[PDB]
Amino acid sequence: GPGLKQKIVIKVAMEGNCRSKAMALVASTGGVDSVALVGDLRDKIEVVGYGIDPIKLISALRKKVGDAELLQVS
Amino acid sequence: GLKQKIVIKVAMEGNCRSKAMALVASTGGVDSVALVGDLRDKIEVVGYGIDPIKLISALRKKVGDAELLQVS
């Protein structure tokens, strides 16, 4: 508690309703404070939270939505 | 078709947080969701073309008691 505070930007392949799936999965993750679609193409998700493990999050995304990659973490 | 800010209060009792966040985030027109308030019991929703009436009833059906607190 509260755990490490991070802002994480993920690129996800979500062209398909696919955006809605990505956003829901990320929003459902423990420690999440905010989730936002960003970039001109709305092809990225910015997540702010406390004690989020980006490793698990990324793996859950690749398993359930599509290819996903960490672009920023701070 | 301007940028909307909608704040909803959700009874956080059923994780109930996670469900609400997931439902709101998956709703049409939604660009961002954020948990806000000292008690983290409100969701701030930003987007374009969000229908607040449908959002609220979807929450009440699926997650629990929810009311609009702010629309701008």
Numbering used by the authors:
A (entry chain B): 184 to 199, 201 to 258
B (entry chain A): 186 to 199, 201 to 258
Could you share sentences copied from the article?
NLRs are a conserved component of plants' innate immune systems and survey the host environment for perturbations caused by invading pathogens. Intriguingly, the NLR pair Pik-1/Pik-2, which recognises AVR-Pik, also binds the effector via an HMA domain but this domain is integrated between the CC and NB-ARC regions of Pik-1. The integrated HMA domains of RGA5 and Pik-1 appear to have evolved from a family of rice proteins that only contain the HMA domain. Each of the Pikp-HMA monomers adopts the HMA-domain fold (Pfam: PF00403), comprising a four-stranded antiparallel β-sheet and two α-helices packed in an α/β sandwich.
The closest structural homologue of Pikp-HMA (defined by PDBeFold [Krissinel and Henrick, 2004]) is the HMA domain of yeast protein Ccc2A, overlaying with an r.m.s.d. of 1.58 Å over 72 residues. Typically, HMA domains bind heavy metals, or lighter cations such as Cu1+ or Zn2+, via two conserved Cys residues and are involved in metal transport or detoxification pathways. Interestingly, these Cys residues are not conserved in Pik-1 HMA domains, including Pikp-1. Hence, the Pikp-HMA structure does not contain a metal ion, and the loop between β1 and α1, which usually contains the metal-chelating Cys residues, is disordered. The absence of obvious enzymatic activity in the effectors, and a lack of large conformation changes in Pikp-HMA in the AVR-PikD-bound and unbound states, supports the hypothesis that effector binding promotes domain re-arrangements in NLR complexes.
